[PDB]
Design a protein around this ligand. Structure first.
Ligand SMILES: *[C@@H]1O[C@H](CO)[C@@H](O[C@@H]2O[C@H](CO)[C@@H](O[C@@H]3O[C@H](CO)[C@@H](O)[C@H](O)[C@@H]3O)[C@H](O)[C@H]2NC(C)=O)[C@H](O)[C@H]1NC(C)=O
Ligand SMILES: [Cl-]
Length: 279
């Protein structure tokens, strides 16, 4: 359902921290030149890349024994998230024609995120199907960070709804809000068992766009607190009141570009190639 604010207390982190650490590396690498044929990141082999973070986010496709076909989506600042929240990029709109028929009536998505996913979605589908066939791999894992984490949530839903065999898991780092309460509860219904939002320390990105604009996160996140530490808890339900707003955010991108279970997602000025478990 729609628009709540869970009051449940946090619980121990139940997510696989090795998978998280890996997924963090796989997405860090989308901030890097990714043309090296067969590059290995953690357990995974890079198979394909498209985009470079100029007209479109860079997307990397890997095969992984633990995660299957892994699609990681870059989160560079194609537009600014921390500024001018009245702008067109933040407006709510109907789902794009490609997948609107799969969504409940009244579903709304943020224009900026949806447009950026739509520039990639057909290319992503084509490549995923190619590499699932080539690797005899049914599992599809979708990973994103920053802008690419909201894009990643849209993509993860798109794969579950539209691709044969659906979604295995999604790992989303520093996830902005993407859709309205109707969207958010459809995420719970369709991929709730498969959804992993990871928030590091004082990261501001999960507070935007604001709820007052009609935006709502899906249920559950793991909050690493302190930022860059190995301490984390899960905050159940949508928009848990005991979570991130109980601790002062920061305006900068330090924790956003921090250390997630020993892997840095430093973004453009981070590690290239990515370094799984280097911290
Ligand atoms: C969590 O770890 C991240 C790195 O993954 C830390 O982010 C970094 O924070 C520093 C400030 O503390 C940023 O400032 C710059 O540092 C560089 C290198 O030390 C320096 O040459 C610059 O002049 C500037 O001072 C740094 O850019 C930033 N790194 C990234 C990739 O964003 C973050 O501070 C850590 N959090 C905590 C609570 O310690
Ligand atoms: Cl590009």
């Amino acid at each position: 359902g729609r628009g709540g604010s869970s009051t449940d207390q946090p619980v121990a982190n139940p997510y696989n921290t090795k998978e998280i650490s890996l997924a963090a590396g796989l997405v860090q690498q989308t901030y890097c030149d990714s043309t090296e044929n067969g590059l290995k990141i953690g357990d995974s082999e890079l198979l394909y890349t498209m985009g470079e973070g100029y007209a479109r986010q860079r997307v990397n496709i890997y095969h992984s024994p633990s995660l299957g076909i892994a699609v990681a989506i870059e989160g560079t600042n194609l537009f600014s998230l921390n500024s001018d929240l009245h702008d067109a990029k933040f407006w709510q709109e109907d789902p794009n024609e490609r997948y609107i028929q799969y969504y409940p009536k009244g579903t709304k998505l943020m224009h900026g995120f949806q447009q950026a996913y739509n520039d990639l979605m057909d290319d992503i589908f084509t490549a995923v199907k190619k590499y699932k066939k080539e690797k005899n791999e049914k599992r599809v894992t979708v990973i994103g960070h920053s802008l690419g984490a909201a894009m990643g949530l849209l993509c993860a839903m798109d794969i579950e709804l539209r691709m044969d065999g659906g979604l295995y898991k999604t790992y989303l780092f520093g996830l902005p809000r993407l859709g309205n309460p109707t969207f958010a509860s459809f995420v719970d219904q369709k991929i709730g068992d498969k959804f992993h939002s990871i928030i590091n320390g004082r990261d501001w990105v999960p507070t935007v766009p604001p709820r007052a604009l009609g935006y709502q996160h899906p249920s559950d996140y793991v909050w690493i607190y302190p930022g860059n530490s190995t301490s984390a808890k899960l905050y159940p339900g949508q928009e848990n009141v005991h979570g991130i707003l109980t601790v002062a955010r920061e305006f900068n991108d330090d924790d956003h570009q921090g250390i997630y279970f020993h892997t840095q997602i430093g973004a453009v000025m981070g590690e290239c190639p990515a370094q799984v478990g280097a911290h």
